[PDB]
Amino acid sequence: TTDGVYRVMTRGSTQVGVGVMQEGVFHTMWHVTKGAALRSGEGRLDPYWGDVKQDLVSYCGPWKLDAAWDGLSEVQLLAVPPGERAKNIQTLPGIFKTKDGDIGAVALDYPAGTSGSPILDKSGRVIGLYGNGVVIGSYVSAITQGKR
Amino acid sequence: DMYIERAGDITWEKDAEVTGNSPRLDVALDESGDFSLV
């Protein structure tokens, strides 16, 4: 239940992704869990809200993360790769230009099991999750944020 | 059996590695959540 960044594991064991606990809600990407319930110790976390097009899901309650990239400043990916300590990677986002507006994007290419890692602004607020993107042959991830 | 394990606090780190470029890309997002270039 504690606030923090978490590995999402499956059963030998494999890391399939990452997520964020905040205000009693667990946040990750839909393609990581496909909405399956999650075990945490002796307890169970049930899905509450999810959307395939946004590629997001929340457990135990509604999506809580609402900060947004300011469009000018560097950010940090708090990457939690399989088998590696959580680590911060600072970068200046580029931009996905879409018919519905601009989305920040980070041109960082980590293992697939890093999907769901949070991207932070300088205040430490989560401005979105890593792991839904496009290939340009380097991968570029949208900064994917939900609605609170 | 999908399960979670805590990996850290959510904090900015002053001593972070810095890397990566900042491309400007035209993209479309389809109903399946997939981005493609335009």
Tab-separated table of C-alpha atoms in Angstrom, chain A residues 3-11 13 20 38-39 52-53 76 78 88-98 107 120-122 124 132-136, chain B:
chain	number	residue	atom	x	y	z
A	3	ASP	CA	3.786	5.035	-1.895
A	4	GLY	CA	6.559	4.180	-4.301
A	5	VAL	CA	7.645	2.598	-7.558
A	6	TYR	CA	7.100	-1.181	-7.859
A	7	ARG	CA	8.133	-4.084	-10.094
A	8	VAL	CA	5.317	-6.073	-11.676
A	9	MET	CA	6.391	-9.733	-11.661
A	10	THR	CA	4.915	-12.930	-13.059
A	11	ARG	CA	5.272	-16.688	-12.586
A	13	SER	CA	9.895	-15.330	-12.261
A	20	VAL	CA	3.370	3.614	-9.232
A	38	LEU	CA	-2.314	-8.277	-8.727
A	39	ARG	CA	-0.941	-9.898	-5.595
A	52	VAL	CA	-6.785	0.369	-23.979
A	53	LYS	CA	-6.418	3.495	-26.094
A	76	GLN	CA	13.740	12.267	-15.179
A	78	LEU	CA	12.785	6.702	-12.866
A	88	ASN	CA	17.098	8.121	-12.585
A	89	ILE	CA	17.829	9.129	-16.180
A	90	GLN	CA	17.498	12.862	-16.913
A	91	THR	CA	16.511	14.019	-20.420
A	92	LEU	CA	14.795	16.806	-22.355
A	93	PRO	CA	11.626	15.367	-23.937
A	94	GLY	CA	10.836	15.761	-27.570
A	95	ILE	CA	7.247	15.982	-28.775
A	96	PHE	CA	4.592	13.778	-30.341
A	97	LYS	CA	2.508	16.170	-32.494
A	98	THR	CA	-1.014	14.801	-32.967
A	107	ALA	CA	13.940	9.038	-26.639
A	120	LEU	CA	9.075	12.879	-13.079
A	121	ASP	CA	9.278	16.657	-13.118
A	122	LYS	CA	11.733	18.601	-10.949
A	124	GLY	CA	9.165	14.893	-7.979
A	132	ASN	CA	3.929	3.241	-25.149
A	133	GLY	CA	5.658	4.701	-28.177
A	134	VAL	CA	6.893	4.518	-31.762
A	135	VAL	CA	10.082	3.588	-33.637
A	136	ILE	CA	11.855	6.215	-35.741
B	1	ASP	CA	0.450	-15.239	-10.406
B	2	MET	CA	1.207	-11.591	-11.150
B	3	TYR	CA	2.590	-9.801	-8.076
B	4	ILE	CA	4.363	-6.583	-7.052
B	5	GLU	CA	7.580	-5.807	-5.170
B	6	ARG	CA	8.614	-2.340	-4.005
B	7	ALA	CA	11.663	-0.925	-5.785
B	8	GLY	CA	12.074	2.631	-4.505
B	9	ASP	CA	10.785	6.035	-3.533
B	10	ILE	CA	9.578	8.424	-6.225
B	11	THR	CA	12.228	11.155	-6.085
B	12	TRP	CA	14.260	13.373	-8.359
B	13	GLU	CA	18.020	12.703	-8.100
B	14	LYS	CA	20.499	15.582	-8.463
B	15	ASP	CA	23.239	13.171	-9.637
B	16	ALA	CA	21.281	11.517	-12.449
B	17	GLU	CA	22.860	10.321	-15.664
B	18	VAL	CA	21.771	12.568	-18.556
B	19	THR	CA	21.182	11.333	-22.107
B	20	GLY	CA	18.816	11.105	-25.051
B	21	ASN	CA	17.683	13.469	-27.790
B	22	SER	CA	14.412	15.417	-28.174
B	23	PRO	CA	12.820	14.554	-31.513
B	24	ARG	CA	9.720	16.272	-32.888
B	25	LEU	CA	7.494	13.691	-34.531
B	26	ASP	CA	4.100	13.736	-36.218
B	27	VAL	CA	2.130	10.715	-34.979
B	28	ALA	CA	-1.370	9.269	-34.928
B	29	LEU	CA	-2.947	7.240	-32.115
B	30	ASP	CA	-5.378	4.531	-33.200
B	31	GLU	CA	-8.190	2.837	-31.330
B	32	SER	CA	-5.893	0.041	-30.098
B	33	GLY	CA	-3.599	2.476	-28.330
B	34	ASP	CA	-0.878	2.159	-30.971
B	35	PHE	CA	1.115	5.173	-32.134
B	36	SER	CA	2.279	5.360	-35.746
B	37	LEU	CA	4.201	7.963	-37.729
B	38	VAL	CA	2.354	10.299	-40.089
